[PDB]
Amino acid sequence: VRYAATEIAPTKSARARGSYLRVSFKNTRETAQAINGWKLQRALTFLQNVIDKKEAVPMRRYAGSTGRTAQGKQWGVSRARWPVKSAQFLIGLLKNAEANADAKGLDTGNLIIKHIQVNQAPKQRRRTYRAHGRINPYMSNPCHIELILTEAEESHLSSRQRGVRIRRALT
Amino acid sequence: GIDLRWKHVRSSHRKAPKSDNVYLKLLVKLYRFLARRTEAPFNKVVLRRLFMSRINRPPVSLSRIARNLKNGNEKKTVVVVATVTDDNRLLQVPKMEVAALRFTAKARARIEAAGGRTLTLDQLALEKPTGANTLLLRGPKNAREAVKHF
Amino acid sequence: SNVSADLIWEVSRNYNSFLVKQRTGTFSRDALNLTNQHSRKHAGFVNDKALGIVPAEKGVKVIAKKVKAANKPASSLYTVTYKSTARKAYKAIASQAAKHGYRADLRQAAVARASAILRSQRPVKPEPPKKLRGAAARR
Amino acid sequence: VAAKKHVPIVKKRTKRFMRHQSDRFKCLDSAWRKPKGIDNRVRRRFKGNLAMPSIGYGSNKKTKHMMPSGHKAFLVHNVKDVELLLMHNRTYAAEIAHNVSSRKRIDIITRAKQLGVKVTNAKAKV
Amino acid sequence: IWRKWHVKINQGQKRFATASALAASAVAPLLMARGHQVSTVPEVPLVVDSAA
Amino acid sequence: IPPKPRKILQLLRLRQINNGVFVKVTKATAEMIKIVEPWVAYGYPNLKSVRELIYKRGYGKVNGQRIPLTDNAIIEENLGKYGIICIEDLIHEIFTVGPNFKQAANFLWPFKLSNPNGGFRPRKFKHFIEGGDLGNREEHINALIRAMN
RNA sequence: GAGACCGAUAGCGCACAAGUAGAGUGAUCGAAAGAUGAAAAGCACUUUGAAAAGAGGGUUAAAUAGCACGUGAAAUUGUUGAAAGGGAAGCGCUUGUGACCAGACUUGCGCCCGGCGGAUCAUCCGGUGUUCUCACCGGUGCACUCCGCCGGGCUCAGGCCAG
RNA sequence: CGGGACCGAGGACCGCGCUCUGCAAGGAUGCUGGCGUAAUGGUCACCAGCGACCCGUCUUGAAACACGGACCAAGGAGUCAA
RNA sequence: CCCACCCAUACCCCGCCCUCAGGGUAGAAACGAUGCCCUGAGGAGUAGGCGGCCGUGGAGGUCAGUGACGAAGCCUAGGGC
C-alpha cells in the first residue's frame, strides 16, 4: 500500500489507514481538516469533545444551508456542527496510529498529525421509491482515510562592478 | 488594392505526359533538349505530341501514309507520334521510311516486306535532328464514337 | 538496348532498397554512393562508372566499377586499399577519379570522403565535464 | 562540430495556433481546426480573435527544419544509421530513436563522437 | 460477399509483365536495388549445370 | 465606381490609388480625363517633375515585366528603334511630346507614388477650384508631385 | 480445412453455470458479465482493535500485481505546494515579475622553432591489378626526406550582448 | 552643409561606370568593450495597457425568434453491387 | 478662413512565405532535370470546383530495422521540427 504523502519516511513516523468506511465523506473531510496539523492528545481530546457536543467542527466547504452556533467563534466561522460518527472513526484510526507508534518505540506525547487525508470510496447503491412508479438512487458516499503522525520539529560581475567594489573596500 | 478587371490565366495545355512509361520519359527528356537547343519547329511539335493522351493520338493507317506519299513526297521520312496500323484494304504497300511511336506487327511486317524502313522516334532524332525532309502526319481525331455522340 | 543507366535511374528513382527518406532529407545506403545522397549523380549502383570508399582497419578502401564486368558481380569491382599517408591516398583517389575521364565530377566528393574517414580514424578527444546551471539543477 | 554558416534563423511566429473554444471545453483538443460555421468570428477574422494559420507564416527556405544550432535532425536507430551522416557533420545532427536500448545508444554515441556528429539526445539512459 | 474480390487481367498484359520482370532479373543493379545479396554471384543471370 | 469611369481608369492604366501616368493632350484624351475627374488629380508637369519621376520611380515594361531603369542598355534594347537610346532621350521625348511619345509613355510602367508628405487639403474629395484636390490644377500639380515622389 | 474478416460497447443476443438471470396472464421479450502471478509462493509470526481491518514483519523480479487483483486515460474528488479574486470567467497583442528550461560555448585549422618515437619519404627494379596510365604489393631510403606525438611562439576562424 | 530613425537581402570573378596607384561603381564592413552564463533566448503562472458576444442549426435578403448543448470516455453517418 | 499635428490591414521602400508567368541548365567536371539558377507580377472569400499533404486498422516488398540492458500504451509548469 502507498500513502499519498510519499515524502515522509517510515523510520520515525507512525501511519494508519481505513478503507471503504461507511461514514459521510463530507463530514469526515471537515473533521479531518479541523484536526489537521495538531498534536495527538489535543486531537483526541477535541474529538471526544465533538462527540460530547462541547467543541464544534467548523463547516467550511461542505456547509451549504447548515446551521449556526456559538461554538464556531473559536474558528472564526458561524457554521459548525458535531459529526459524531466521523469523530468516532477518526478516534479509532488515531488510536491505531498511537499503538503503531508505541510498538515502534516513538514518543507519543510529542507526535503531531503531519498528514491526514479523506478520499471518496466507491459508493453504496441503495434505491428509494418515488411517486408515479419511479425509482431513484439512495446512495451512501463512504470514504478512505489515511493519516501519518511524525515527531514534532556574487558571481559573473562585470569589470566595472569589480573595480567599484575594490575601490570601496580600499577607501 | 488594385482593380484587375482582367484575370491572369494559368496554362491550359499539358506540360508533361501523364504516363508513367519510363521509355516515354526518356523520349520526353531527349525532345525537351532538342526543342530547347534547336530552332526547328518540328521538334517542338513532336515534344507537344509526346505529351498528349491517347484520344489526342489517333492511329494512322498505311493507306493514309500511302495517300500522303503521293505528289513529290515519296522520299520524305514520315513522322507519326501515334500508332501506325495496317490496312488490309491496301493491297500494295509502297516503299516508305516511317518513324512512329509504335507499330502494329502486321504494319511493321508489311512495310519491311515492301522494302521500307520503320524507325523509333529516338532513331528519328539521331538521323533527322532538325526534322529535315519529313512528312508529319496525324490520324483522324474526330473519328471516335464519343465525338460522334457529342 | 533495353537497359541503360538512364533506364535504371527511371526505374529506381522513386523507391529502392537503399533509400532512407525522412522529413529533413533523403539519404542512400548504397556502397557506391559518395555523400550518401539520393541523386542520379551519386547513385553509384545506377551509374555505369562509379566509385565508393569504405574504412579499412587503417586507411581507406576504394572500389570502382568495371564497365566490362557489369553482368559479373563477383568480378565487377576494382578494389584498392590505401594504408599510407593521407596526401598519397588523396592523390591516388583523385587520379582514379579524374585522370582518365572516370567520373571527374566525383573527385571532390571522393577526396572529401577519404578525408572524412581518415579524420574519423583519429583518436577522439575527451569532452569537457558538463557545467551544472541554474537553481534546480545546480542545487 | 559547429554547423555550416547560415543566415539568421527567423521564426515569424513562435506561439502555437490554438483551436477556438478548446480553452473552454475539455473534450476539444487544442490542435488547430479551421472553423467552418458561417457566422464564426475567428473564421470571419474579426479583430481581437485567434489568428488562423496561413502560408504567409512560412519559414525561410534556407533555414527550414533547422534546430537553433543550425543542424537538421536525422533519426537514427543504430550505428549503420548514424554512419550515413559521415559527409554531413556540419549540416545534420543525429537524434537517437526513443526505443533504442541503452547499450546500443552507447555504441551510437561513441561512433558519432568518432565521426564528429552532434547527437541531440546524447545524455539519455545514462 | 458479392463484393468484387477478383480482378480480370488481359492475358497479353500478364505476358508483358512477366517478360518485363524476366528482363529486369538479368540486370544486376536492379537485384541490389531490390535487396538481394548478390555481390559474390559470379554471373547474372546465374546458370547452373543441369547435371548438378 | 460606375462601369464607364472604371473602364476609363483601366484604359489610362490607373488601377491602384496613387498610380500616375503621362498623357499627351488631345481631345480624345482630354474628354476621358474629364469624365474620371471624381477620382484623379492631373496637371501640367514641368521638367523637374518629369526628370525626378523618371529617375527615382522609372520602370520599363520589358516582356511584360516591370524592370527598374538603372542602365541605358535597357532603354536602348526596348526603344532604340525610335532613336531613344538613353534616359535623357526618354525624358526629352516625354517632356517635349515627341513623335514617339506613345511608345515612350507606354514603355514606362505606371508610376507608383507614395502619399504626399504634408497630406492633402482638408476636404480631399472636392474639386481644386472649390478647395479640394480633384480635377485639373494645371501647374500646381508639381507641388503635389514633389510631395508624393 | 481455411481468411488482406472482428478483437470483449467489436464479432452471433451468448468468448463466462446464455436463450441463462430477469420481465410478462400469455403469445413473447431478453441482458450484464473475459485478463493476479511463471508458480498461490494468496502474507508465517508479533502487535493494536469487539470486528472489519491497520501497523510491523514476510512472499515475489515486481504487492508501484493483495482473490476490490495486467496496463490503469478522462470527467470528478482529497491532501500538499504556488497564485489570483471590490457584481463572471475564459481568449488576442505586448512588456514586466517569479518559477523552470533547451541550445550555444569549452577551442580548431595553418605556419615557424625545439625535443622525442618510428621508417608505409623521392627515385629505381620485379610482380599484380586497372580506367592502359594510373595504382598497390615485395626490395631500395639511413634520416637537410616523410609520418605522429610533446613543449612554446604567430596568423586566421570561433559563443552572447553592446559602443 | 548638418541632425535623427529603420534596414544590411546577396555570397569567388564577370557588368555599367567614375573623381582611375584607387572608388561611395551589379545589397556591410572595419575598430573596440563587457560577459561566456540562465546574461541573451524560450515555456508556464499572474498582474498591467489596449483588443475581444456562445457555439452549432434554421430562416429569409438579412437579423431577431426558435431548436440542440451539465461533464467525460468509447461508438457514431455518401457505402457496396449491377 | 489659416497653420501645424494624430492614425487604417489604404499608398511608398525593404525582408520573408506561397501561387502564377517568362527565361537558363549535356560531344554532361553530370542531376532527388520530379533538381538547381535568374527575373517579374499577384495574395479577402459562402454555395461550388480542383490540387497537395497529415493521420488510423490490415496486405505484399524492403530497412541483414527497434525490443526483457524494456516493445506497445499512459502521464508530463521538460524540449526540437
Residues C63-73: b if buried by 16+ CB within 10 A, e if exposed: bbbeeeeeeeb
Angle, alpha carbons C7-C8-C12 (nearest 5°): 120
Residue A140 gets which letter from DSSP?
A: B
Question: What sign does the dihedral D15-D17-D23-D27 (CA atoms) show?
Answer: negative
For residue F54, which amino acid is it?
A: I
**Cα–chain-centroid distance for residue E43?**
17
Q: Shortest CA–C1' contact from F72: which nucleotide?
A: H16
CB contact under 8 A, B25 and C10: yes
Task: Provide the H-helix boundaries in chain A.
Answer: 25-35, 40-51, 84-104, 159-170
Judge whether F148 and F113 are in contact, CB under 8 Å. Answer: yes
Angle, alpha carbons A83-A88-A93 (nearest 5°): 125
Task: Tally the residues of chain A.
Answer: 171
Say whether the CB atom of C83 is under 7 angstroms from strand G: yes
Judge whether F29 and F23 are in contact, CB under 8 Å. Answer: yes
**D75-82, long-range: CB < 8 A, 24+ apart:** D75/C22, D76/D108, D78/D104, D78/D107, D78/D108, D79/D104, D79/D107, D79/D108, D79/D111, D80/C29, D81/C20, D81/D108, D82/D108, D82/D111, D82/D112, D82/D115, D82/D117
Dihedral angle computed from the Cα positions of residues B50, B53, B55 and B60, in that order, rounded to the nearest 10 degrees? 20
Q: What share of chain F is helix, strand, coil (3-state, %, to 5)?
A: 45, 15, 40
How far does C82 lie from chain B, in Å, by closest CA?
40
Nearest to D16 by CA among D36, D37, D30, D2: D30
CB contact under 8 A, B26 and C11: no
Nearest to A25 by CA among A167, A159, A140, A170: A140
The residues, any chain, with a CB within 8 Å of residue C25's CB and separated by 6 or more, are: C37, D72, D74, D92
What are the counts of helices (DSSP H) followed by strands (DSSP E) for chain C?
Answer: 3, 5
Is F3 annotated as a binding-site member?
Answer: no
3-state secondary structure of C74: helix
Residue C29 contacts D where some CB pair is shorter than 8 Å: yes
For residue D122, which amino acid is it?
A: A
What is the spatial distance, in angstroms and rounded to an integer, between the CA atom of B23 and the C1' atom of I52?
27
The residues, any chain, with a CB within 8 Å of residue C6's CB and separated by 6 or more, are: B26, B29
Residue C17 contacts E where some CB pair is shorter than 8 Å: yes
* Residue D43 grid cell: 473564421
**Cα–chain-centroid distance for residue C14?**
21
Residue D119 gets which letter from DSSP?
A: B
The rounded distance, in Å, linking the Cα atoms of A45 and A91 is 9
Please, how many CA atoms are within 13 Å of residue F35, restricted to the half-sphere of its CB? 16
- Whether residue C123 is preceded by a cis peptide bond, meaning omega within 30 degrees of 0, is no
β-pair partners for A148: A15, A115
Residue C60 contacts D where some CB pair is shorter than 8 Å: no
Angle, alpha carbons E44-E49-E52 (nearest 5°): 125
Say whether the CB atom of B1 is under 7 angstroms from strand I: yes
Q: CA separation (Å) from C18 to A58, D81, E1, E27, E29?
A: 75, 12, 41, 16, 12
Judge whether B50 and B29 are in contact, CB under 8 Å. Answer: no
Angle, alpha carbons C35-C36-C40 (nearest 5°): 90
The residues, any chain, with a CB within 8 Å of residue D23's CB and separated by 6 or more, are: D30
3-state secondary structure of A63: coil
The rounded distance, in Å, linking the Cα atoms of C80 and C72 is 19
Q: How many CB atoms within 10 Å of residue D126?
A: 8
The rounded distance, in Å, linking the Cα atoms of A51 and A14 is 25
Q: CA separation (Å) from D51 to D22, D35, F77?
A: 14, 11, 48
Give burial (CB, 10 Å; 0-12/13-18/19+) of A78.
middle
Strand C19-22, strand C25-28: pairing: antiparallel
For residue F117, which amino acid is it?
A: N
Say whether the CB atom of A106 is under 7 angstroms from strand G: no
Q: Shortest CA–C1' contact from D100: which nucleotide?
A: I66
The rounded distance, in Å, linking the Cα atoms of B99 and B77 is 7
Dihedral angle computed from the Cα positions of residues A58, A61, A62 and A67, in that order, rounded to the nearest 10 degrees? 50
Judge whether A50 and A87 are in contact, CB under 8 Å. Answer: yes
CB contact under 8 A, B26 and C6: yes
Concatenating the DSSP letter of every residue in A39-55 gives BHHHHHHHHHHHHTTSS
Nearest to D114 among C27, C113, C124 (CB): C124
Task: Provide the H-helix boundaries in chain C.
Answer: 5-12, 86-98, 107-120
Helix axes F47-57, F141-148, angle to 10 degrees: 20
Greatest extent of chain C over all pairs of C-alpha atoms, in Å:
74
Judge whether D40 and D20 are in contact, CB under 8 Å. Answer: yes
What is the spatial distance, in angstroms and rounded to an integer, between the CA atom of F16 and the C1' atom of G92?
32
The beta strand positions in chain B, using DSSP E, are 60-61, 77-85, 97-103, 117-119, 134-136
Q: CA separation (Å) from F55 to C53, E2, F24, F91?
A: 59, 78, 20, 9
For residue D69, which amino acid is it?
A: S
Probe site for chain B from F9, F15, F18, F66 (most B CB atoms < 10 A)? F15
CB contact under 8 A, C11 and B22: yes
CB contact under 8 A, F9 and B3: yes
**C123-130, long-range: CB < 8 A, 24+ apart:** C124/D113, C124/D114, C127/D113
Strand B77-85, strand B60-61: pairing: parallel
CB-to-strand G under 7 Å, chain A 86-105: 92, 95-96, 99-100, 103-104
Judge whether B83 and B76 are in contact, CB under 8 Å. Answer: no
3-state secondary structure of B76: coil
F16: left (phi over 0), alpha (psi -120 to 50) or beta: beta
Nucleotides of I under 7 A from a protein CB: 1-2, 4-7, 9-13, 15-18, 20-22, 24-26, 28-34, 39-44, 46-47, 61-72, 80-81
For residue C123, which amino acid is it?
A: P
Q: CA separation (Å) from C32 to C54, C110, C115, E31, E40?
A: 9, 11, 17, 15, 16
Q: What share of chain C is helix, strand, coil (3-state, %, to 5)?
A: 35, 20, 45
Q: How many CB atoms within 10 Å of residue D98?
A: 8
Which H helix or E strand runs over C65? strand C60-65
Say whether the CB atom of B10 is under 7 angstroms from strand I: yes
Probe site for chain E from C12, C32, C63 (most E CB atoms < 10 A)? C12
Residue nearest to nucleotide G133 (CA to C1'): C100
Q: CA separation (Å) from B94 to B63, B102, B137?
A: 10, 19, 17
Chain breaks in chain D (C to N over 2.5 A) after: none
Say whether the CB atom of C26 is under 7 angstroms from strand I: yes
Judge whether F71 and F55 are in contact, CB under 8 Å. Answer: no
